[PDB]
């Protein structure tokens, strides 16, 4: 366990699964980041359909 | 503008900001997608707070 | 055998039953600690401790 | 977040856990901000390592 | 981090060894200042110089 643990890592300190980690996370029991900017994409469809007519 | 368009692309073409079109994704607005996984990791010291002693 | 083992994990490394491990956790011969409501974890550390040379 | 102001590669990567060679690319990619002091004196700034990590 | 550091703060800056700041001072590639017998003091400016972005 460095100071930033994998999903992985935690799992296998905590005697858990990594499915189990990823719930605490996503319940904030556990907090976690992400390392670096993401690849966002917009879906066309929903830009054309923010667009209303007058 | 392809089916899935950079937040710069949609910015360029909707007339807007690329920060307005961020908060029309954080508003439900517009619809976004990351591309792949990201690279998690959990706080190390939130692991040793979730161990609550008995 | 984890850092942190489920409660049968640590009743069979022993070689004894889970309700001897729970008794153990009670009268304070182990240490445990509670992730979630309905989840426990012994210490390895003091599943060591419990040992003594004969 | 008690690394050194100016971190060394390693230790960014001890304190990520993640690999050197990640820290490396990162750098490469812009994600991570570095200086170098001398010939091969390479050093991670402490403040892009903080906004490398956004939470989930 | 003053004006005028020591060879240690300096150091701690940097994260190098003192050996390592007193060398680069040596070299030219640090300005330092002598206060008196024993005191040596490195000049910010030359440190904030000595880091050159990649």
Chains 1, 2, 3, 5 share one sequence.
């Not at 994998?6 to 980041?33: E, F, H, M, P």
């Amino acid at each position: 366990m460095p100071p930033r643990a994998s999903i992985q890592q935690t799992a296998d300190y905590l005697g858990v699964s990594t499915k189990t980690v990823r719930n605490y996370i996503a319940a904030g029991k556990l907090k976690a980041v992400r390392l670096g900017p993401r690849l966002i994409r917009v879906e066309r469809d929903s830009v054309e359909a923010l667009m209303r007519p007058i």
